[PDB]
Amino acid sequence: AAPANAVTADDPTAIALKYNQDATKSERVAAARPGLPPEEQHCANCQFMQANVGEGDWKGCQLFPGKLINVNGWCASWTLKAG
Ligand code: SF4
């Protein structure tokens, strides 16, 4: 079950960025974002994921203030975690 503050499918920014809480149900291949082959991309290896926010599989994303994403998710702003 998603937390009460999970990013949901009807969130305008989630629609615009094609977020899904399950990267296997995402369009990461189509987007071909740079940094890793697309099948390897998900929130856990994204620069915007905030490991000190949330709990368990539900963590922060800088782009979704006040919400939680799933570490196994993806959106089109995926960027390699470089630091
Ligand atoms: S920016 Fe990164 S951490 Fe945030 S939802 Fe998109 S892929 Fe996940």
UniProtKB/Swiss-Prot annotation:
Keywords tagged on the record: 4Fe-4S, Electron transport, Iron, Iron-sulfur, Metal-binding, Transport
Family: Belongs to the high-potential iron-sulfur protein (HiPIP) family.
Keyword Nucleotide-binding carried by entry: no
Keyword check for 4Fe-4S: yes
Temperature note: Thermostable.
Name assigned to this protein: High-potential iron-sulfur protein
GO biological process: aerobic electron transport chain
Originating organism: Thermochromatium tepidum
Oligomer and partners: Homodimer.
Domain of life: Bacteria
Residues that hold [4Fe-4S] cluster according to the record: C43, C46, C61, C75
Role of this protein: Specific class of high-redox-potential 4Fe-4S ferredoxins. Functions in anaerobic electron transport in most purple and in some other photosynthetic bacteria and in at least one genus (Paracoccus) of halophilic, denitrifying bacteria.
InterPro entries, alphabetized: High_potential_FeS_prot, HIPIP_sf
Record GO terms (molecular function): 4 iron, 4 sulfur cluster binding; electron transfer activity; metal ion binding
Lineage: Bacteria, Pseudomonadati, Pseudomonadota, Gammaproteobacteria, Chromatiales
Gene: hip
